Structure formats: C-alpha cells, structure tokens
C-alpha cells in the first residue's frame with residue numbers, strides 16, 4: 001500500500017511562515033488521510049499494483065481525488081524549504097525573467113492567480129512544452145501532472161486548511177509566507 | 193449597494209457549537225468581503241439595478257461567485273439558532289419521516305452527504321417540485337436557488353473556514369454542532 005512520505009524537514013523548520021501546528025494537521029492528518037483513503041479504495045481493483053502517478057493519470061472519482069491529493073501534497077512539501085525564500089536562482093530565475101520580464105512581475109502575477117483562485121484549489125508554476133514557464137490554477141484535486149507536455153515546477157496549496165490556523169482569511173499573508181519559503185532548488189531540479 | 197445583513201443573534205449565541213471567533217471571522221470578515229466584492233463589480237454592468245436573487249439567477253463567473261456566496265451565507269446564518277437543535281417539528285418533521293422513514297435515517301443520510309462533499313461546498317436540505325424533501329450538495333458558490341421547482345430549506349456551509357478554528361479537520365464534529373443548532377422554525381417557514 002501507499003505510505004505517507006516523511007516531511008522533508010523538522011515540523012517547526014518552516015516557522016514563522018508556516019506553523020508547527022499547521023504542519024501537524026496538514027501533513028500529519030490531512031495528507032495521511034488521503035493516503036489511508038486511497039489504500040482503502042484500491043484493494044482488489046485495477047489500481048491494485050500501480051504507482052501513484054499511474055493512478056492519478058488514470059482515475060476519476062474517489063480514487064483520483066485521493067491519489068492526486070497525495071501527489072499534489074508531496075509536491076507541495078517539496079516546494080517549501082527552511083532554506084528557500086528570496087530571489088530565484090539558476091535556470092528558473094532566468095526563465096522567469098524570459099516570461100514575465102522580472103521576478104517582481106512574476107511574483108505579482110502568481111499572487112493574483114492565487115488570491116483569486118476561487119475555493120479549495122491549487123496554483124502552480126509550470127514549464128510548458130515550448131520550454132516556457134507559466135502559472136495555472138487547478139481546483140480541488142486537479143493537478144497539471146495529467147496535462148500532456150506540462151511539467152509541474154512548484155505549487156501553492158490554497159485549500160483553507162493550508163493557512164487558516166496561521167492567517168485566517170488573509171491569503172496575501174499566507175502568500176508572503178510562501179515567498180519566504182519557496183524551494184528554488186526543487187524548482188530548478190524539476191525545470192531541468 | 194448590497195449590505196452585510198446583521199447576525200440573527202449575539203456572536204456567542206451558538207457557543208459551544210460554533211464559537212464567537214468563527215462567527216467574527218465567518219460573518220464579520222468572509223461574508224462582509226463577498227458583499228464588498230459584488231458591490232465593486234455591479235456598477236456599469238446589466239446588474240446595477242437587480243435584486244440579489246435576481247443577480248444570482250442571471251450571473252456568471254465573478255459576479256455569480258460573489259452574489260451567490262452572499263445569498264448562501266445569509267441563508268446559512270438563518271439555518272442556525274441558539275434555540276434550535278434536537279428533533280424536527282411540525283411540517284418539516286413529518287416530511288422528513290415521509291421521505292427517509294425516520295429522523296435518524298435522514299440525519300445519517302445528510303451527514304454522509306456533508307462529510308463526503310469534496311472541497312469547498314454546501315450540503316442542502318431542499319424541497320423538491322413534487323413536494324418531497326431531498327439532500328443535495330453544491331460546490332464552491334453553486335446554490336439550489338438557481339434550480340427551478342427546487343425550494344431551499346436549510347444549508348450547512350462546508351468550506352473549511354466554517355469550522356477549522358473550532359474543529360480542525362473533523363467535519364463530523366462540526367456536524368455534531370450543526371445538529372445542536374439546526375433552526376427548525378426557519379426550515380418550516382421555507383417549507384410552508
């Protein structure tokens with residue numbers, strides 16, 4: 001069966017941006033529930049012996065909601081880092097300049113998409129088939145991982161459990177936290 | 193310009209089921225925000241002079257998300273009361289018996305609809321064209337108000353801000369608070 005990946009850092013490693021408690025519920029409870037829920041759904045079904053990605057790329061309903069959420073979340077914890085934040089670097093920094101003209105322009109473009117992403121959703125930095133960076137929003141469990149020629153680069157969870165303990169209703173404050181945490185390294189690895 | 197309706201009871205009136213804080217953020221911030229956003233979008237569009245209900249039955253995208261959320265929320269506040277909870281009464285109680293056989297059947301039915309309502313959503317007790325009761329789920333800002341022949345009776349907000357402060361990730365606990373607060377007098381008024 002599937003297992004809950006270990007967090008890539010200490011539970012308080014992302015303080016003061018994302019709290020030890022948010023990580024305890026978000027990773028320890030929510031992510032974990034998606035994993036039990038998927039395990040509880042695959043016994044004696046096609047998805048029996050398949051990899052997570054194989055499953056998301058081939059299901060609908062409950063199996064997809066749960067599998068995608070497991071993948072989307074693991075992608076999310078990686079998008080954050082106790083040593084991330086600040087100016088982008090290497091190849092990603094450059095492709096962001098190619099696309100938006102500047103990092104600041106990219107930042108404002110992402111924020112806009114994220115604050116306005118209606119309901120439980122996800123906002124992604126992606127690499128397109130033409131090799132260019134773009135920002136796309138997904139709702140609930142939808143993930144670009146299932147889009148041909150689209151390479152997820154980074155993601156921001158916008159379901160309210162991701163920031164309500166720490167920022168209540170103000171997404172902009174949460175996003176301020178994300179930019180302090182952004183894992184550019186994970187970003188460049190995915191990009192290249 | 194639309195306005196934030198006043199809360200039907202004191203901010204601590206739903207304690208311990210729904211805290212003073214949830215109400216301050218939920219009613220005082222979340223709901224207020226929809227009001228300001230729709231008030232910001234109507235000017236210069238074919239909605240300027242229409243009623244809230246008129247807007248939500250004819251709008252799209254942003255104007256709809258907003259107007260509907262205002263309607264849904266106003267309905268939601270009325271579905272709770274410091275003097276509600278417990279067994280259904282009068283007309284609604286007997287209709288529940290007619291459809292589900294027993295109040296408990298109805299209840300287990302509804303809880304199951306609500307608990308599995310993926311992402312931001314609403315679970316509704318609606319009165320159908322045939323005169324019977326049914327439970328239906330909408331996601332994000334969708335509302336049965338836009339379905340002809342379908343009269344909305346009660347609703348439970350399932351967006352996470354509605355319960356996270358008080359219950360974190362456990363919707364069933366939230367639902368326990370909802371059944372302690374159900375406003376049967378409002379349900380019966382809408383049914384009659």
Ligand SMILES: OC[C@H]1O[C@H](O[C@H]2O[C@H](CO)[C@@H](O)[C@H](O)[C@H]2O)[C@H](O)[C@@H](O)[C@@H]1O
Pocket residue numbers: 060061062063065308309310311313329330331
């Ligand atoms: O995994 C169970 C089902 O979850 C989804 O359906 C639920 O959530 C929807 C909103 O996201 C509701 O409208 C619906 O009423 C719920 O049952 C999923 O779409 C279903 O295919 C799953 O079977």
Ligand SMILES: OC[C@H]1O[C@H](O[C@H]2O[C@H](CO)[C@@H](O)[C@H](O)[C@H]2O)[C@H](O)[C@@H](O)[C@@H]1O
Pocket residue numbers: 116117118119121137138139252253254255257332
């Ligand atoms: O009012 C702004 C827009 O809100 C919705 O679209 C946003 O939220 C969607 C998810 O619910 C995202 O997919 C989308 O990218 C966001 O822009 C609404 O559907 C749009 O019509 C509104 O313009």
Ligand SMILES: [Fe+3]
Pocket residue numbers: 026030073157159161162
């Ligand atoms: Fe999440």
Ligand SMILES: [Fe+3]
Pocket residue numbers: 218222265349351353354
């Ligand atoms: Fe709400």
